Design a protein around this ligand. Structure first.
Ligand SMILES: *[C@@H]1O[C@H](CO)[C@@H](O[C@@H]2O[C@H](CO)[C@@H](O)[C@H](O)[C@H]2NC(C)=O)[C@H](O)[C@H]1NC(C)=O
Lengths: 49, 49
């Protein structure tokens, strides 16, 4: 959507490239999961409330 | 099945995954222009000697 805004004639051209979009999505999902894990690990030390 | 497609595997482990988008397709098409009726004077440039 960022690179080829709702244009099939552009998505087709993008598909001729590699798996760059999948790689970027993987990286950003990993970043988000890492941030959630950091927040969980810093505060949820003791589980009893 | 879409998750299986984007994950490139026949078995999906437990978790939450991101698949495609939900881009809303337009219902129909509108075109708006000023109501200019006079044809452009192309006879004074083409039909000239
Ligand atoms: C004046 O210009 C018009 C528009 O280009 C010409 O009229 C057309 O000319 C073509 C090419 O000869 C014909 O196929 C069409 O049938 C003509 N009529 C229309 C309504 O398109 C016209 O020939 C030009 N006049 C001169 C003297 O060059």
């Amino acid at each position: 959507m960022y690179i080829c805004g709702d244009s099939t004639e552009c998505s087709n051209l993008l598909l001729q490239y590699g798996s760059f979009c999948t790689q970027l999505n993987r990286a950003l999902t990993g970043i988000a999961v890492e941030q959630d894990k950091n927040t969980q690990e810093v505060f949820a030390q003791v589980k009893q409330i | 099945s879409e998750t299986k497609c984007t994950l490139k595997s026949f078995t999906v482990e437990k978790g939450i995954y991101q698949t495609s988008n939900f881009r809303v397709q337009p219902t129909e098409s509108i075109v708006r222009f000023p109501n200019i009726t006079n044809l452009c004077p192309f006879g004074e440039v083409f039909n000239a000697t």
